[PDB]
Amino acid sequence: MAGERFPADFVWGAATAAYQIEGAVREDGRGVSIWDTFSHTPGKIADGTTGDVACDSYHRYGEDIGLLNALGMNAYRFSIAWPRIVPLGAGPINQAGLDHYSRMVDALLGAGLQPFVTLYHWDLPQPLEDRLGWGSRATATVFAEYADIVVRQLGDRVTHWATLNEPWCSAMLGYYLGVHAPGHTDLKRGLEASHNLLLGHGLAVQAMRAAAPQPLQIGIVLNLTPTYPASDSPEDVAAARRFDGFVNRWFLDPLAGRGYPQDMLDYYGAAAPQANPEDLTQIAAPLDWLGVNYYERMRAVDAPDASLPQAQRLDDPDLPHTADREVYPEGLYDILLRLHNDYPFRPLYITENGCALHDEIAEDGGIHDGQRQAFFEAHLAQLQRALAAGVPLKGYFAWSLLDNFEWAMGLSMRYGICYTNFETLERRIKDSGYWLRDFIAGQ
Ligand SMILES: C[C@H]1O[C@@H](O)[C@H](O)[C@@H](O)[C@H]1O
């Protein structure tokens, strides 16, 4: 009921992050990141792996370009590693680092692949974490200095930039739940980190506008989880609102000029961050787009005896599941309709969508990942519905181009549209990747 075609100028890409794919962790002046420290801490990664080699994309990005070209994509979302650019976090530049990314940008543009660059995809320089990391306002200031450096050199060629990827993860997984680097476990520290991440975003936007050699299209990338109460009871509805506030509105509202949501301030009490009119104005620095990373919904039941927020997930077993998630494509439509009608950000990009499976190389040599094909098919159908409703959607990036180091899950959780043999570093396009190729060409 939503037609057949996407816009002719739609952006079609795949996405990666530097620590997940690059390897070469000590090469060419790179400094230590929090993810180097964390992955080298016994027990923090499920399978004893690290990003030391990963996909070896520091050396093999040309192979990655070959895959993007084989897929007929027109864009590549990737991150720049702050440790390669400013190894001390705050300090001199490492021109060799910048020059690596300059050559990669030129290779992408030569191939007809628009670079969509993420400045911060979780790889904070360890020296900054030694000075409290996102627990310090200074980290926000020097993040903006890094953003300036990078834009000054690459902004003649790269128009589309994101400051941060998934600040909820960096703050809440990294400083509250301890599952991500740097691995702290305190709610107040997580909420403080969340504020300094938003402040760093806003300071960076302003620094990038001043350093820009041409006008830029600057955004931020948020994970969003559409949340639904398991019943209409006051208790379940309130649990859904608390979860929705914890993940989504805590970030969307300040970005939208609305301040932090008061219901969440009330809930968090004394753990809430120190945070004034001046910082809010900074946080709301005008953006040219918003990136949405969408994977799943949350169907919330009140659970008065759990950690902040007392919201238990109610699984639907009749819905399919992947290796690690429930599949719910209609949530993509729902979150986009909400953003379109309720929030000011536009245009919108889906900067990540994808799934993990127990992928293996079959006897014939292919990877028969039909559930991942079906995942893309169903989510793209929802995007057509969103477009029909007027949502100002301008592109879609599959997470991920290739299997990679999936954070606390290690190399063991495969999200690629291309398979990565981590021993030999060979990549092979999965059946879902060929489906994407053919879908994109058919448009
Ligand atoms: C599965 C995918 O999840 C998102 O949370 C991230 O931005 C990306 O690095 C990867 O973890």
Ligand code: NA
């Ligand atoms: Na399954």
